[PDB]
Design an enzyme around this catalytic site. Sequence first.
Site, PDB file in Angstrom:
ATOM      1  N   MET A 220      24.809  37.827 -22.086  1.00 38.83           N
ATOM      2  CA  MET A 220      26.178  37.268 -22.120  1.00 38.83           C
ATOM      3  C   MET A 220      26.896  37.625 -20.823  1.00 38.83           C
ATOM      4  O   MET A 220      27.577  36.782 -20.243  1.00 38.83           O
ATOM      5  CB  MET A 220      27.011  37.759 -23.326  1.00 38.83           C
ATOM      6  CG  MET A 220      26.687  39.165 -23.774  1.00 38.83           C
ATOM      7  SD  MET A 220      28.108  40.115 -24.303  1.00 38.83           S
ATOM      8  CE  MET A 220      27.293  41.591 -24.764  1.00 38.83           C
TER       9      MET A 220
ATOM     10  N   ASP B 151      42.389  45.601 -10.783  1.00 39.14           N
ATOM     11  CA  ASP B 151      41.735  44.322 -11.127  1.00 39.14           C
ATOM     12  C   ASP B 151      42.169  43.836 -12.515  1.00 39.14           C
ATOM     13  O   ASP B 151      41.334  43.553 -13.402  1.00 39.14           O
ATOM     14  CB  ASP B 151      40.196  44.345 -10.941  1.00 39.14           C
ATOM     15  CG  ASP B 151      39.566  43.049 -10.401  1.00 39.14           C
ATOM     16  OD1 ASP B 151      40.261  41.997 -10.380  1.00 39.14           O
ATOM     17  OD2 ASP B 151      38.385  43.093  -9.982  1.00 39.14           O
TER      18      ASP B 151
ATOM     19  N   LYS C  61      43.215  41.204 -14.960  1.00 42.48           N
ATOM     20  CA  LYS C  61      42.909  39.784 -15.115  1.00 42.48           C
ATOM     21  C   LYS C  61      42.407  39.545 -16.534  1.00 42.48           C
ATOM     22  O   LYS C  61      41.911  40.469 -17.172  1.00 42.48           O
ATOM     23  CB  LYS C  61      41.864  39.318 -14.057  1.00 42.48           C
ATOM     24  CG  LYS C  61      40.572  40.115 -13.991  1.00 42.48           C
ATOM     25  CD  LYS C  61      39.667  39.449 -12.991  1.00 42.48           C
ATOM     26  CE  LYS C  61      38.322  40.094 -12.913  1.00 42.48           C
ATOM     27  NZ  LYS C  61      37.573  39.609 -11.716  1.00 42.48           N
TER      28      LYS C  61
HETATM   29  C1  LIG Z   1      28.892  30.959 -18.790  1.00 45.14           C
HETATM   30  O1  LIG Z   1      29.806  32.040 -19.100  1.00 45.14           O
HETATM   31  C2  LIG Z   1      29.681  32.577 -20.325  1.00 45.14           C
HETATM   32  O2  LIG Z   1      28.923  32.172 -21.174  1.00 45.14           O
HETATM   33  N1  LIG Z   1      30.537  33.605 -20.508  1.00 45.14           N
HETATM   34  C3  LIG Z   1      31.544  34.057 -19.534  1.00 45.14           C
HETATM   35  C4  LIG Z   1      31.511  35.567 -19.402  1.00 45.14           C
HETATM   36  N2  LIG Z   1      31.651  36.199 -20.726  1.00 45.14           N
HETATM   37  C5  LIG Z   1      31.850  37.660 -20.689  1.00 45.14           C
HETATM   38  C6  LIG Z   1      30.544  38.460 -20.539  1.00 45.14           C
HETATM   39  C7  LIG Z   1      30.820  39.963 -20.555  1.00 45.14           C
HETATM   40  C8  LIG Z   1      31.577  40.355 -21.812  1.00 45.14           C
HETATM   41  N3  LIG Z   1      31.809  41.782 -21.862  1.00 45.14           N
HETATM   42  C9  LIG Z   1      31.727  42.500 -22.994  1.00 45.14           C
HETATM   43  N4  LIG Z   1      31.444  41.872 -24.150  1.00 45.14           N
HETATM   44  C10 LIG Z   1      31.471  42.623 -25.261  1.00 45.14           C
HETATM   45  N5  LIG Z   1      31.761  43.917 -25.380  1.00 45.14           N
HETATM   46  C11 LIG Z   1      32.060  44.559 -24.206  1.00 45.14           C
HETATM   47  C12 LIG Z   1      32.460  45.917 -24.254  1.00 45.14           C
HETATM   48  C13 LIG Z   1      32.783  46.592 -23.113  1.00 45.14           C
HETATM   49  C14 LIG Z   1      32.725  45.961 -21.865  1.00 45.14           C
HETATM   50  C15 LIG Z   1      33.141  46.657 -20.676  1.00 45.14           C
HETATM   51  N6  LIG Z   1      33.470  47.179 -19.717  1.00 45.14           N
HETATM   52  C16 LIG Z   1      32.338  44.637 -21.775  1.00 45.14           C
HETATM   53  C17 LIG Z   1      32.024  43.904 -22.950  1.00 45.14           C
HETATM   54  C18 LIG Z   1      32.897  39.610 -21.896  1.00 45.14           C
HETATM   55  C19 LIG Z   1      32.684  38.102 -21.894  1.00 45.14           C
HETATM   56  C20 LIG Z   1      30.588  35.754 -21.645  1.00 45.14           C
HETATM   57  C21 LIG Z   1      30.647  34.261 -21.816  1.00 45.14           C
END
Ligand SMILES: COC(=O)N1CCN([C@H]2CC[C@H](Nc3ncnc4ccc(C#N)cc34)CC2)CC1
EC number: 2.7.11.1
Length: 275
Positions: free
Chosen positions: A24, A133, A135
């Site tokens: 992800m 940062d 955002k």
């Molecule tokens: C094409 O693009 C996608 O499909 N995309 C865009 C980017 N997104 C992100 C990926 C990283 C995610 N990060 C996280 N996800 C869960 N739990 C966490 C706990 C802590 C931390 C930190 N420090 C990070 C986490 C947030 C969403 C996923 C869909």
Amino acid sequence: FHSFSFYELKNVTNNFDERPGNKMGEGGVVYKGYVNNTTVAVKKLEELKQQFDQEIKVMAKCQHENLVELLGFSSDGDDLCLVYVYMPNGSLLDRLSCLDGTPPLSWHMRCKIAQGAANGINFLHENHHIHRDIKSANILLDEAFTAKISDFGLARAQTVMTSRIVGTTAYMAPEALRGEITPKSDIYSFGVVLLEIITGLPAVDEHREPQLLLDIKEEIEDEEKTIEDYIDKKMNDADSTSVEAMYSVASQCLHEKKNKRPDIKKVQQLLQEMT
Ligand SMILES: COC(=O)N1CCN([C@H]2CC[C@H](Nc3ncnc4ccc(C#N)cc34)CC2)CC1
């Protein structure tokens, strides 16, 4: 924090399965996992080690309901992993864009998120940390859609300058783009986040006019546009009084002069009065 073995992490993530199935990540690359039968987020990462060390240092002293919780790390491997409690509703950015078909956030949810994000930043500043940062991609959402500030790799403990200008251009205060390090720059970035919450629009869009979201503030101030023309249309529960109260906070955060900007305590107090 727990010092996880690289082999344990390398395989709670199915050898870092790059298919969306463990991947992800877009931080660093984030993978979903299970350790002490807790759902976890494993973020796999020279200056990268310095940002890893800073992440642990800030997380060690900063524990709050509106900040991500670091559980552990891995260094004696190949290499550099950070373990957090998994945020099932991803980022504020993704949810605003309804990525992967998720329903749009309601105004009520959006007010609770703006409040939560502000409480998170207030804690950081009280504890003498500048995020650098702020955002919507760094505002994470848990099982109850509670806002949790993430990414403390670039954090620092006015009058301060740097030769390595860092952050996201579309969110940066004019002084941050010139190398100044001030908590007043986090206030500016938060103003941009408030505009993203109100409009549902990303801070930058190459194929949009204007490209930069902060440019709408001037369109509204020049009577060329109204905040009503920009309110996200993917909501049914928004009201003029609270949208205006939130825009007034965003507009105050977005003052070009850093000294004219409200402090985080004023921002937090204004978003509370909005509800
Ligand atoms: C094409 O693009 C996608 O499909 N995309 C865009 C980017 N997104 C992100 C990926 C990283 C995610 N990060 C996280 N996800 C869960 N739990 C966490 C706990 C802590 C931390 C930190 N420090 C990070 C986490 C947030 C969403 C996923 C869909």
